Amino acid sequence: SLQDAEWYSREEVNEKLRDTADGTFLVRTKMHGDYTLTLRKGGNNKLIKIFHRKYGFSDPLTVVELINHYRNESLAQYNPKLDVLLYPVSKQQDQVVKEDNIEAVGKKLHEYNTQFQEKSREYDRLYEEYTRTSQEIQMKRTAIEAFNETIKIFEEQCQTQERYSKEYIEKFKREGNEKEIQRIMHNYDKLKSRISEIIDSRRRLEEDLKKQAAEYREIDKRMNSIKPDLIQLRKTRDQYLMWLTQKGVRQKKLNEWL
Amino acid sequence: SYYHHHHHHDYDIPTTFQGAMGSMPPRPSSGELWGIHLMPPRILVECLLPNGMIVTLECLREATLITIKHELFKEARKYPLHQLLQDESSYIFVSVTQEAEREEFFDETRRLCDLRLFQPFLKVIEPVGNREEKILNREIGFAIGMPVCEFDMVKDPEVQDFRRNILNVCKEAVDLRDLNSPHSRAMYVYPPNVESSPELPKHIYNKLDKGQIIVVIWVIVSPNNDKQKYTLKINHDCVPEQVIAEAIRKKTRSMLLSSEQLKLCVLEYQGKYILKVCGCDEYFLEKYPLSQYKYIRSCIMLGRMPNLMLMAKESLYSQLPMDCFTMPSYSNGETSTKSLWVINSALRIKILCATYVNVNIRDIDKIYVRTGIYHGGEPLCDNVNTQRVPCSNPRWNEWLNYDIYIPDLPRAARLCLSICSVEEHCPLAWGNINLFDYTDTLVSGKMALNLWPVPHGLEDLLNPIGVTGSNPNKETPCLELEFDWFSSVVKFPDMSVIEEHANWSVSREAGFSYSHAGLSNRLARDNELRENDKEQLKAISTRDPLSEITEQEKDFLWSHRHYCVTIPEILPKLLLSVKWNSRDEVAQMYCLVKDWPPIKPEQAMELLDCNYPDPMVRGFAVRCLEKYLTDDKLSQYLIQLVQVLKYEQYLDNLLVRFLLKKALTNQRIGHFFFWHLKSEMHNKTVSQRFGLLLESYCRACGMYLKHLNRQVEAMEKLINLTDILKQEKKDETQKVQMKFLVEQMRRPDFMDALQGFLSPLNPAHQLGNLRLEECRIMSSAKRPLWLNWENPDIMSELLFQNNEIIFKNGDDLRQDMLTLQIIRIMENIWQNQGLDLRMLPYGCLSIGDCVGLIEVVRNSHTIMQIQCKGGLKGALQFNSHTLHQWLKDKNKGEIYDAAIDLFTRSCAGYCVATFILGIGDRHNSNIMVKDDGQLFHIDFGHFLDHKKKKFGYKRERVPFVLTQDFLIVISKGAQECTKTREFERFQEMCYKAYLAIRQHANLFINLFSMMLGSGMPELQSFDDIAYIRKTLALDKTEQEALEYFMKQMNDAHHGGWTTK
């Protein structure tokens, strides 16, 4: 029972404590101390040493005895800023279809891990489209600015000649009027339809920008519906592998399934 | 009956992928004209004249603006209103560029393709902005890649305050340069390339005559052509001056000069020369032992006789142009505002509305905003809001109630929040805000916060390592919110006020009485502590940063915080043991830090990671670097420092001011300081920050801005080129592609831009002409270019006549960059601690978004090539010995013995580093052997066992498994290699190597800690780094570690490893 207490290295503790609630806990050099209560609070892990010579945290020394009491109680009274042992989460035969086959639990571990690894690709795939799309979008916006900025120069250019050209109609006039003003007007007519093209160019980008900005939303939309599946699939896969590592060691046998 | 006749109906092959021809994804970014990579060879450009006339010139892609202007005014004769035009000389071209700014093209030698025109048109105008010299900010904005005018119209006062304040640093550097000019100007440009230690390793020292080297000094006369050797045999630790004398002695001994007359000729001639390295721009400019310069110590190890050159100081001081730093065109609070400590209420924050939430209503039930206060770790119970108005128009108008009194907020406090989905908990976006601004002012009002997408590795809801500030991407989840307004701007208290509160808080502990419940957090021992305690503190000190401290140990540490000054190196642990949610505590820690002992940089770099966001802390950390960190040690760790800038709260801060000063003091540091900043410019977490900083550097660095602008242009050419090879010219034969590559490179704009410049891998090495016949595309699917330049040094012959480096658009280099850097450090750790293991950390540089440069090591082949070449006609089975046979084919005689020693040394080092860094599985096509018998790894892929993301767990992988091939060579050529003295020695190298790197595990953990800042998916959070904790076995004692390593090495090999 002290061995087989439900809740009873640093690194793989944290991967069990990873993504659990405020109040979740478990117990862990020989010279340093003995056992280590690793309590989770709001995303960070508080480690509390159990010294033995009685077992205890420091002064009130009077393993399973010490942990049960606190399960009812807060750790603020022992040490001030620990206003928080509610979740003793260390079961994983709650679900796993209760499968006592062992070999079939191993087959299932592969099944989920394929479904996971399949899901992690599609998630990675969409993260790239997202980031490429963000780039292609802002490149489109910066083009639009330049398109407008270009047109301003061309609008100014069709205006610039109106000053000089229609000073060079009235002065003289008679001197080649039809032979002169034609080829000033031709220039002016080439100039404005060119503006008419550039505007028709920019418009066409903006319609594409909305179709891009549309697709962009759809990437995020489908990312966020692949995330929760990807978490629970991963979390089920940790537990199916825990179930195995409880009963039979077989650390090297795992590699073919995984 | 294969598949139980089960159809997959959804499965569709007809153009269905990233998998099919599975390589090269880095796209996209644009080049020569809007929407097209490479402008047509002949193109029509509208030329807008000041008379209003659009004349349209057909002209060549490659055509200079002088050529085009000339032809424009010849052609403008044929159009009307010609009399209205000035002389062509009274005009300048202007157009709209791809950055959407109207650049005036002043340098009219530039070509139509190189201008980045957006649309092909030019406008003619007389030169406005009469200070033309000032509008060579285009220089700066080309080097940076975003135009300087883009900063000028930024509203944000911090940014604008940064720009004006940071100039302090630039003036100070420039002043330090032009101090002992022309000497110190040359010292800036050509800093001595020098090992950190003058002391010599015992194995280096024994490759001499009890401390003597043969050198070869070279000199020239007329015109240049003939040069004369002068082969000295000096002491290893004599300075350049001495070496220069002896060269002149030999040069100027004569039968017509007496003994005295020689000595008097020596003195006049002596200090008119300095030593250059033959073959590259490197110089020996200050009193260092010759051994200390890196070229010498390389020459010693490689069995080479140095080739230096006597260089006239005035022929050098010719080639330095003046830097001429100019101050730019861009050249407080209402009093008694507040002590933050007057505010008598809890913290509360109003969460108003998220706008742009993109979610499946069918999939998700409900959505909510999670929040929390942080300091790296969290000052209070993390809280949420209720699951209101789920999915559609998500609107809560709640005040969240954080149990912390507003005075107890520390200076560096930060709100970290995230919109989530619902036990179906799952983050959607996230974003963090600094609870104070840069002017110390508490945040009060309304803030719109555009959020960041949840990254790959993060499953956690909240992400407080993530960058402080709003996402520049507009069309993303914007969650707007409101902070409490206290009828006055609240400012953070002065250090003068905190220094008093602490001095009081201490006196209030001296009167607290006898038994105290939770004594834990204060002394009781007084001046006389226990002997057992004082040794438990030094035990905590020695433990690595990732061995997290317990609440007892924290309280313990804090209670003896004043004894902890005796053990300076404890500080990292002490700081983390402070209750940052208690200003009583914090104020005291401000006084401790204020005059805490300086510590060694390798330990003070821990203090600049994300777990230490305080200003006073990171001040002390920089204060350490100012004292100890040498210009050598800075350029080793430069990456880890530039990355660490991301974790600073504000643009203007002491670390930024330290590095910027150093970058302008040392043109080698500057060169990489530029490229590492420039590299990450694509990343919008740092675009602004790094742009601004790069502006400062570029304004201050002198002539090197012009050199970088060239380097910059070379890269752009190559990016644009490969970009086409990878898109239009995919599905074409090598032959067809290669013909396109040469075609392009023969054009004059390419021949201009790619020939005369400095290698970004090492700006010592120049790059002269392109030899196109040795230029080619490699076989990889990424289409890496194999580029080859003629080294234009006077003494090319003496070093390398050809330089050649690989440019690779396609792959994120910055993981290799790191692992190679890690190896480079491991080597120097082993070797300077006397044990010769030869790693070849080949050069690698990322210069953008999956774009970079890799150094070619000449004469080295993949184990595969060794076995392809050495493999018998009848394709059946390759011989294990063919490696060994090939190696004998190179090394013959006493030479053979030495090449195996090298292969046995390099292999032992590359085994240990590999195991420790957990790099990608080694196999015949990513392992390489050199002719001289040095083995080295290439293409590392992922590092810290990043494919443990899929399954993983306690895999503790051996990535370099020595097959027979390797073992044979190690033990000369015997049957059952496993059992020789040759292989006994090998093992003892591996055991002594593994324990060397294990006693520096702090450094290596820390280096990886500091790299979290970069968006490498390999380094998402400290548990990613924690693999190195397991591999080195830091939980255990060294003897247990040794046996753990043996075990781990034994099992992969299946027999060989257990004696001692």
Ligand SMILES: CC(C)(C)OC(=O)N1CCC(N)CC1
């Ligand atoms: C000579 C030596 C390799 C020690 O020089 C450096 O410290 N570096 C740092 C990393 C750079 N990419 C190459 C030069």
Ligand SMILES: CC(C)(C)OC(=O)N1CCC(N)CC1
């Ligand atoms: C104006 C700009 C800096 C873009 O031009 C260059 O990149 N170069 C290379 C050729 C020139 N003649 C010297 C400077």
Ligand SMILES: CC1C(=O)CCCC1=O
């Ligand atoms: C607070 C502590 C840390 O520094 C990283 C996050 C988890 C921890 O235990």
Ligand SMILES: CC1C(=O)CCCC1=O
């Ligand atoms: C052989 C050719 C190529 O260059 C890539 C694969 C498909 C092709 O047609």
Ligand SMILES: [Cl-]
């Ligand atoms: Cl290589």
